[PDB]
């Protein structure tokens, strides 16, 4: 990724990312946008065209009017954790909402990166028309979906294997190399998807 392309992607994200009202960590919000700018510009442009907003939050997701209906609800795959959506720091799918400061593994989740995982879900659902549930990806998932850990979540839900693999592919060179070694068919699939 050259200088102009990273800048172009940040420009696209300037039309996608929504910052919270009130006090928030501006530096960390900027760092999250910079990580999202590593995503292939084709996907970011499609998110913008679809008026998908990436909402950065300074408080709980369920304190937003549009997610209040999830109070007390246990997310898919979170059975037995003792947590509900009130405790979950990010959400992706038909919308994206993310708590600032909770990017890294261990900040209330075990994803390699919160914002890439959530945005991957939006790309899957909105841009790629649920490609993670296509026969092609289900076949890859059947072979490689238990090779990235967290097998009772990533190994059981193809959309979660897709989202986490996408996050590995786009976070940094180290995670990208790890994905290629663990899940070569998934890596090739993502490489071809971006063409």
């Amino acid at each position: 990724m050259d200088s102009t392309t990273i800048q172009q992607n940040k420009d696209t994200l300037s039309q996608i990312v929504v910052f919270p009202t009130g006090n928030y960590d501006k530096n960390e919000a900027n760092a999250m946008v910079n990580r999202l700018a590593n995503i292939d510009g084709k996907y970011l442009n499609a998110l913008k065209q679809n008026n998908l907003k990436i909402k950065l939050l300074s408080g709980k997701l369920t304190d937003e009017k549009e997610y209040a209906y999830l109070k007390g609800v246990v997310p898919k795959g979170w059975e037995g954790t003792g947590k509900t959506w009130d405790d979950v720091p990010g959400l992706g799918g038909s919308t994206v909402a993310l708590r600032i400061g909770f990017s890294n593994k261990g900040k209330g989740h075990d994803a390699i990166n919160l914002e890439l995982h959530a945005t991957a879900h939006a790309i899957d659902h909105i841009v790629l028309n649920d490609i993670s549930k296509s026969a092609q990806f289900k076949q890859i998932f059947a072979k490689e979906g238990r090779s990235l850990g967290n097998v009772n979540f990533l190994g059981v839900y193809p959309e979660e294997f897709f989202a986490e693999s996408f996050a590995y592919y786009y976070l940094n060179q180290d995670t990208n190399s790890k994905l290629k070694s663990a899940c070569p068919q998934t890596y090739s699939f993502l490489q071809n998807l971006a063409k």
Partner: peptide, 7 residues
Amino acid sequence: EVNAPVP
């Protein structure tokens, strides 16, 4: 559709 991160 809503999806949480890895638990």
